[PDB]
Amino acid sequence: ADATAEWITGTTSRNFSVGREGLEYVWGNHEPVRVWAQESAPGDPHGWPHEIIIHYYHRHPVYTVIVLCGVALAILVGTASSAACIAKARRDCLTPYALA
Amino acid sequence: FEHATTVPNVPGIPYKALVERAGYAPLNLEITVVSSELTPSTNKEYVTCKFHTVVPSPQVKCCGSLECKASSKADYTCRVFGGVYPFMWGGAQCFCDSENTQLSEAYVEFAPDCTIDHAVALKVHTAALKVGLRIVYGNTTARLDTFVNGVTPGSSRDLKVIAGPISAAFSPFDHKVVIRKGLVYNYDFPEYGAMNPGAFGDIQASSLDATDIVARTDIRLLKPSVKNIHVPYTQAVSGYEMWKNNSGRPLQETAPFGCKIEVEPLRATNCAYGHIPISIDIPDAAFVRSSESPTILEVSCTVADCIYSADFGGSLTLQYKANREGHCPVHSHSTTAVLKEATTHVTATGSITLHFSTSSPQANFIVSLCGKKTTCNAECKPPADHIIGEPHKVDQEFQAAVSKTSWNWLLALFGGASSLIVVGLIVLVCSSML
Ligand SMILES: *[C@@H]1O[C@H](CO)[C@@H](O)[C@H](O)[C@H]1NC(C)=O
Ligand SMILES: *[C@@H]1O[C@H](CO)[C@@H](O)[C@H](O)[C@H]1NC(C)=O
Ligand SMILES: *[C@@H]1O[C@H](CO)[C@@H](O)[C@H](O)[C@H]1NC(C)=O
């Protein structure tokens, strides 16, 4: 509970970060007001991949950057390894016709 | 029937369940945690407040000298001043010229308004949870209040309920707390007998009307400069005022999991930090025979306009082919989607509508009208409202939070890479045969 207490004079504007857990604010002698944040990130998770990418990046940034990093690393490693395998097979099958 | 389940600790958000005896029709079970309170075992270490620092009348003795003994009064500081000349109204108070001796006394004692403006220092041990439960079964609503520590049938009527242990008790109060005027603070107050001048606990007593009061204020007695009969003293500032100036904020504004602190007794009510296992020995009076319950024949849910949010942003319609007349319940069997109604009256071959809350982009879930299960799918949309006024009905699941389409491209890229590895290895095999 990142409790912030401030004495406020005059007409100002204050920014607070609400999560799915919720945030409760008390303003003067008023009764406490509790609010909750729901997953309303911009984009559509059901449309094109770029909209899904920006939506899930706005939802959870570290998980999204690490899963796209995993996808990129996995496809790069797979293509490199299978290119090495194809080159191995190519030169192995081309050397009996290369000695003769 | 003994039914075991696990309900969230969150006050409000009523919880759905479906009990199914073998020889009886399925029956609703609605568990609502209407209230809760963590009441820890506390003991009074001491009470502290202002000091009156009463100074008695000086004892001037003359043509000689006197010495003062120690006393059991709180913070007894005593000094003897020689070579004085006490001069009250009317002249010199004795006749021994510049050999006169004066005794000056000083001790502290509780202020007259310490009955209200006082701070009680308490040690807080582990806390036992009360939970008030509203149980709706078999069209009947019952209110009850039980312990959570385990094996405590504190319910009434024919409902026996047992609340299992808390998954992880969090104990919002620290080991040491200070209660002043209905406000609770987490302060590491010094122990009984341990006391500093100008700090909290400068004066100490078991009660406000206790003779045994102990204090160590930095009080000290000074030689009277002016020829009068005053007692000049300098004393350290009260630690009560110093702590009041910089107490910070109380527990009512600094508390994890959003639950409010009350006094007499010290409690933290409506705490939302886990799950309670509930075992219910539901009676057989609410159970109805399967033959007398109107069973359905074939259903299929076709949801329209799903929006996954904290509210009930769903509307699925069921197409029932029931045979007899009456009502018999509904229940969503997924941990990600929770229905709104409990029972629905079914006539024959008709259509009903229901509302559900979910947190997943897809709603691929099983709804069991009256016992017979039937799953259906959805393509739900994110909500427009950023901030919403009531808490979420369900919890996000890591498998369900990924949408079906995004799941499809993730397994598409992963399976393309994997099949590319497989074709690489079989190309290696076809190279190895030659
Ligand atoms: C508060 O947040 C809004 C929207 O997030 C932003 O436009 C604004 O600049 C912020 N104000 C301050 C004082 O940081
Ligand atoms: C509960 O009451 C409702 C409406 O009053 C009735 O239709 C139903 O038969 C009752 N259910 C049970 C299990 O007694
Ligand atoms: C507390 O004391 C400080 C300095 O000792 C003073 O400035 C302040 O006005 C006092 N009161 C509060 C409420 O902070």
Question: How far is A60 from chain B, CA to nearest CA, in Å?
Answer: 11
Q: What is the DSSP string of B175-190?
A: SEEEEETTEEE---PP
| Binary contact (A39, B386; C-beta < 8 A) | no
Q: How far is A11 from chain B (nearest CA, A)?
A: 23
Question: Which residue in this structure is represented by tokens 């959003």?
Answer: B258
- Residues B306/B314, Cβ–Cβ less than 8 Å: yes
Identify residue A58 by its one-letter amino acid code.
H
d(CA B132, CA B145): 4
| CB contacts, 8 Å: B416 with chain A | 75
Structure-token match 């075991």, residue found: B4
Nearest-neighbour CA in chain A from B430: distance (Å): 8
In what side-by-side order are the strands of the sheet with A33-37?
Answer: A23-25, A33-37, B387-388
| Cα-based torsion angle of the residue sequence B199, B200, B201, B206 in order, rounded to the nearest 10 degrees | 160
Q: What CA–CA distance (Å, rounded) separates B232 from B248?
A: 35
Return the closest-CA partner of residue B81 out of B94, B98, B95, B93. B98
Contact between B315 and B303 (Cβ < 8 Å):
yes
- For chain A, counts of helices (H) and of strands (E): 3, 2
Give a three-class secondary structure readout of B54-67: CCCCCEEECCCCCC
Residue B255 tokens read as: 């508390």
CB contact under 8 A, B431 and A56: no
Q: How far apart are CA B15 and CA B191, in angstroms?
A: 46
3-state secondary structure of B428: helix
Tokens of residue B230, six digits: 């005053």
Residue of B403, B418, B423, B429 to mutate for A, most A C-beta atoms under 10 A: B403
Amino acid at B204: Q
Q: Indicate the resolution in Å.
A: 3.3
Interface contact B421-A37, CB threshold 8 A: no
- Tokens 């702590």 map to which residue? B243
* Range B150-156, long-range pairs (CB < 8 A, 24+ positions): none
Please give the residue of chain A at the shortest CA–CA distance from B379.
Answer: A46
What lies within 8 Å, CB to CB, of B178 at 6+ separation is: B119, B120, B121, B122, B184, B185, B187, B189, B200
Which residues, other chains included, contact B303 with Cβ-Cβ below 8 Å and sequence gap of 6+?
B314, B315, B316, B317, B363, B376, B378
SS3 B196: coil
Phi, psi for B143 (deg, rounded to 5): -110, 135
- Centre of ligand 2 to C-alpha B139, Å, is 6
| Token output for B360 | 């997943």
Per DSSP, chain B holds a count of helices (H) and strands (E) of 2, 30
Q: The tokens 């568990």 sit on which residue?
A: B31
Q: Pick from B161, B124, B119, B129: which is nearest to B143 by CA?
A: B161
Partner-chain contact A74 B310, CB within 8 Å: no
Dihedral of the alpha carbons of B413, B415, B419, B421, in degrees to the nearest 10: 70
Contact A45 B249 (CB under 8 A): no
Q: How far apart are CA B71 and CA B57, in angstroms?
A: 16
H helices present in B113-191, as ranges? none
Identify the DSSP state of B205: E
Task: State the virtual CA torsion across B226, B232, B234, B239 in degrees, nearest 10.
Answer: -150
Q: Please, which residues have CB within 8 angstroms of residue B157's CB and are 6 or more apart in sequence?
A: B142
- Measured on CA atoms in the order B398, B404, B406, B408, is the torsion positive or negative? positive
Whole-angstrom Cα distance, residue B406 to residue B3? 38
CB contact at 8 A, B45 and B192 = yes
Angle ∠(B392,B397,B403) on CA atoms, nearest 5: 100
Residue B60 phi, psi dihedral angles, 5° rounding? -90, 120
Instruction: Name the method of structure determination.
Output: cryo-EM
Among A residues 12-71, those touching chain B with beta carbons less than 8 Å apart: 18, 20, 22, 24, 26, 34-41, 44-47, 49, 52, 55-56, 67, 71
Question: Is B163 in contact with B278 (CB distance < 8 Å)?
Answer: yes
Ligand 2 — pocket residues by CB below 6 A?
B 138-139, 286, 288
Q: Which residues pair with B80 in a beta bridge?
A: B103
Q: How far is the CA of B298 from the centre of ligand 1 (A)?
A: 54
Q: How far is CA B246 from CA A27, B42, B48, B187, in A?
A: 21, 25, 16, 11
| Alpha-carbon dihedral B367, B373, B376, B382, rounded to 10 degrees | 20
Instruction: Please report which helix (H) or strand (E) contains residue B161, including its range.
Output: strand B160-163
Nearest Cα neighbor of B274 from B359, B171, B356 is B171
Q: Report the residue of B252, B253, B434 to disrupt the A interface, i.e. the one with the largest count of A CBs within 10 Å.
A: B253
**CA terminus-to-terminus distance, chain B:** 70
Helix, coil or strand: residue B128: strand
Asked whether the beta carbons of B303 and B317 are under 8 A apart, the reply is: yes
Question: Taking CB atoms and an 8 Å limit, are B387 and A1 in contact across chains?
Answer: no
For chain B, state the CA radius of gyration.
37
Dihedrals φ, ψ of B99, to 5°?
A: -125, 0
Give yes or no for a contact between B396 and B380, defined as CB atoms under 8 angstroms apart: no
How far is B310 from A20, CA to CA, in rounded Å?
9
**Rounded CA separation B111/B168 (Å):** 44
Peptide bond connecting B190 to the previous residue in cis, omega within 30 degrees of 0:
no
User: What pairs with residue B44 in β-bridges?
Assistant: B122
Rounded Cα gap, residues A11 and B6, in angstroms = 47
Copy the structure tokens of residue B166. 């808390």
